[PDB]
Design a protein around this ligand. Structure first.
Ligand SMILES: [Zn+2]
Ligand SMILES: [Zn+2]
Lengths: 457, 457
């Protein structure tokens, strides 16, 4: 078990430290609750619980959570909800140009990544791809990578208008394109149970669904606008057991083949014992041989220089993540980490500060009526994850708003409260048992904006 | 009672003929139902009902509506729903460049009108303003003229991108602007009961709400984009009793004063006995005196030539509608026509083919969860309008889709069925009594596209 020459050691250590700290903050709540349940409800109950909470979780608890526990029993569910919300707040607060130039040199003025809403793909940008979130990098996760065409088209139009009017990334005459990346996931160890649940854990079904959505988006962009407007499409598959990516190389015209791809597992295997420059040569030629391969991978021409450079950089970055997983877990995630191990249900736009693998179940929705199935899937997952142990389900309803648009924050807060009430009236049996805990938050759309808590009522 | 020299007589006759035909098609159903209720449920019930329907409504009825009526009683509610749907279909089927040049000469490359969702404002474009619906004219009605800023901003961005890329209306360097018109309504005879129900029938409240929304949209456009991007705003008030408009004249910088306006009632009064050219001179100077007036109407500078020409054309067009109302109803709508007299509830994008005053109650919504209050208001209105007489409430769920975007039609049909089910589960008491009848339809976003019925399940 040696180290790859291209591994980013200090970045790996930093990422591991952040992951460990956040997961520990979320996980230490349960032992504290178990200790609390053994404290008699005497006259010293409140003081003892408060000092124990200060010693364990680093914060105290509101007296309303403990004031009437002597007559109403231990308020373990309320303490759990409060502690989970505090852990999420602490994680976000603790988290809180070169990428644009690199994208421009590769021939793109904007990169749009649409991975699956699976929790195992949450850390796709900071861990698997090592791509920072910039003003021109977007991450819109959907269930089964089934991203919506209309909003992507609107984003494309907005970016093109910005290029035409101000040329913020670059002037409109530059021959750069809009890059849309679709990410599917699969499990090598358990293909039939640990795959994409949106497609019945069928690897090829997820692959073809993502490819079809990419093709539909490209054709919609072509149809909606004239003068030969077009976009570039990229397809990436992630093995959730080893966090290794296979990138489907487009041909000269940009079409993607489900069989023409570069797999980073064999690349890591065959570049382990070489030297940095030689490994870079290896991946540079390997992209070419994969793109020029025949048979089922028959492709017309070869991909552009920018495409190949971008894919090579992606593979080099993913090598560090493969090495990170090998170091931390001996080459494969533990059996508990292979499946669902989420700590809370994220509803709305999600958090850009806690992009950690298998931390939360994300349900991209603006209305419960439109995407109820995501909420039901999350509740079903947490029924086994949490309700089996008797713990309540924590739900963070987070939304982003644009401060430039007048009245946007109030509308966003109203939307958050509406979502909270809709999730309340559904699963009303779980509500009556206090098995659902909520926290509502809003944030400005700018990167690094503070997160503001809002009252549930 | 003489005729205004500027009245468009043949256009008035044509409009009156269409209004009469559509309203008669909708209204003749009830007498037919009353005749049907007197037919004994013998062996000749089906044949007699079918021949009566052919003689009266011009179409037959499905046998399933009448096959089991002998044991289940008269199916008057089902026949009512079917006949109302057929009447709407007949009206739409019967309904089924110069404007762009006129807009360009006035300095606008796109006109966006956002009237109140009141049924009395339904015929605002073809009757009150005489403005045809073109590829660059949009009509987005909202309750209380409370139009949404985000979609308007998206439409502005799309239009500007089209100008920059292809210059379909005109090239981007042309000094034209995007024109946004907000229309509020008021009642002269019954100000406190027949005003804007979204603002408690308060005229000044509706005026200031519309003005505030226009100002918010202008400031949002200014903030979201640099290089001094801006839009033009116009405010119009409509007296639903006489269909007369007062247009608030902007000053040199485009700001609007709630007190600086030209009223078309006094204009019609003072131009009745003059000649066409003299009347045109009168309205041309009247715009100037109103815009230069002082006191509460103090404004900085005078409006541009294009603005004044557009407002003058609007007033000249509205003169014909004032004359039309004077001819048909003796100067004021009948007391039954002053209030609510709608025939069905339109849910979704509405119909561009039946723009007739007080024909339908429109509820602009994509989700019942988001805009439930519109549905409740419509149900409350039709409880007095229809449920008092024992008739069911007819609801047309209509939506528009873009054929260019792949999979758009299927998504739209799914959305229509979802809306239908959501309205079904709400007001379930009305559903169980068969007091809600539905028809679901989709249409391509292009003007003049056919309307396609879809099954409720
Ligand atoms: Zn998935
Ligand atoms: Zn109104």
């Amino acid at each position: 078990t040696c180290r790859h020459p291209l591994t980013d050691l200090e970045a790996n250590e930093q990422l591991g430290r952040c992951e460990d700290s956040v997961k520990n903050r979320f996980d230490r709540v349960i032992p504290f609750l178990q200790v609390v349940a053994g404290i008699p409800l005497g006259l010293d109950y409140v003081t003892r619980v408060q000092e124990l909470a200060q010693s364990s979780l680093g914060h105290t608890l509101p007296e309303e959570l403990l004031k009437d526990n002597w007559i109403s029993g231990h308020n373990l569910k309320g303490i759990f909800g409060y502690a989970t919300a505090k852990a999420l707040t602490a994680a976000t607060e603790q988290f809180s140009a070169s990428a644009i130039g690199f994208f421009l040199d590769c021939g793109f003025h904007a990169v749009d990544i649409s991975p699956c809403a699976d929790g195992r793909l949450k850390g796709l940008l900071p861990y698997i791809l090592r791509l920072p979130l910039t003003a021109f990098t977007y991450r819109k996760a959907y269930a089964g990578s089934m991203f919506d065409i209309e909003d992507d088209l609107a984003q494309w139009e907005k970016n093109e208008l910005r290029r035409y009017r101000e040329g913020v990334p670059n002037t409109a005459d530059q021959p750069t394109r809009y890059l849309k990346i679709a990410v599917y996931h699969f499990s090598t160890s358990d293909p039939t149970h640990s795959g994409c649940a949106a497609h019945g854990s069928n690897d090829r079904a997820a692959l073809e669904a993502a490819l079809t959505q990419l093709m539909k988006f490209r054709e919609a962009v072509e149809n909606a606008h004239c003068c030969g407007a077009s976009i570039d499409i990229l397809l990436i598959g992630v093995d959730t057991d080893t966090d290794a990516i296979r990138v489907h190389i487009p041909d000269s015209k940009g079409f993607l083949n489900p069989y023409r791809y570069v797999d980073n597992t064999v690349t890591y295997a065959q570049t382990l014992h070489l030297a940095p420059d030689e490994a870079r040569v290896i991946i540079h030629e390997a992209i070419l041989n994969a793109n020029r391969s025949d048979g089922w991978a028959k492709g017309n021409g070869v991909a552009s220089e920018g495409m190949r450079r971008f894919i090579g950089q992606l593979l080099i970055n993913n090598l560090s993540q493969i090495d990170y997983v090998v170091n931390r877990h001996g080459g494969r995630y533990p059996p508990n980490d292979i499946g669902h191990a989420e700590r809370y249900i994220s509803v709305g736009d999600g958090f850009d500060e806690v992009q950690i693998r298998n931390l939360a179940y994300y349900a991209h929705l603006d209305t419960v009526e439109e995407n109820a199935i995501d909420v039901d899937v999350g509740i079903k997952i947490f029924t086994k994850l949490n309700l089996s142990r008797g713990l309540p389900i924590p739900i963070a309803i987070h939304y982003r708003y644009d401060p430039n648009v007048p009245g946007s924050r109030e509308r966003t807060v109203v939307k958050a409260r509406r979502i909270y009430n809709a999730i309340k009236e559904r699963f009303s049996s779980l509500d009556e048992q206090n098995l659902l805990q909520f926290r509502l938050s809003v944030q400005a759309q700018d990167i690094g904006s503070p997160i503001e808590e809002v009252a549930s009522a």
